[PDB]
Amino acid sequence: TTDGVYRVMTRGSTQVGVGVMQEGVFHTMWHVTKGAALRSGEGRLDPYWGDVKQDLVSYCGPWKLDAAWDGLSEVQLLAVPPGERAKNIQTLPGIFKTKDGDIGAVALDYPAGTSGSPILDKSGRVIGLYGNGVVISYVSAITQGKR
Amino acid sequence: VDMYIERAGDITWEKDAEVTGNSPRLDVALDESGDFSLVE
Lengths: 147, 40
Hints:
The complex is a heterodimer. By secondary structure, chain A is mainly beta. Chain A contains 1 helix and 15 strands; from the N terminus they run βββαββββββββββββ. Chain B is 0% helix and 45% strand. In chain B, β3 (25-30) and β4 (36-38) form a beta hairpin. Chain A: Residues 1-147 form the Peptidase S7 domain.
């Protein structure tokens, strides 16, 4: 239940993604878990909210992450790749321009099991999750939910 | 299929992080399935 970044594993074991625990709620990308229940030690985490179009899902409560990229500053991907210690990768986001507004995007290409890794602003707040994007080289949207 | 979670770290900014990656500006569309695609 501790705040932090977590690996999402499946059973040998394989890492299928990453997520964020904050305020007693686990946040990851829908495509990582497809909404399946998660085990945490002897406990079970059930899905609470999910949306395929946003590609997001929360467990144990509503989505809590609400910070947003300021459009000017560098950010850090807190990447948790399979088999590797959590590590911070700093970058200046580009932009996804859409009919419904602009979304920050990071031109960083890490293994698929890194999906769900948080992207952070300078104050350490999670401004979105890594792992839904396009190819041009892969570019990930900074995907943030609604609180 | 047993899907489970393991803590991997605190959520913190790191002063000595490596810096990399460019900052492309892309026109994209988001469809009902959550899939981004390029638009021209």
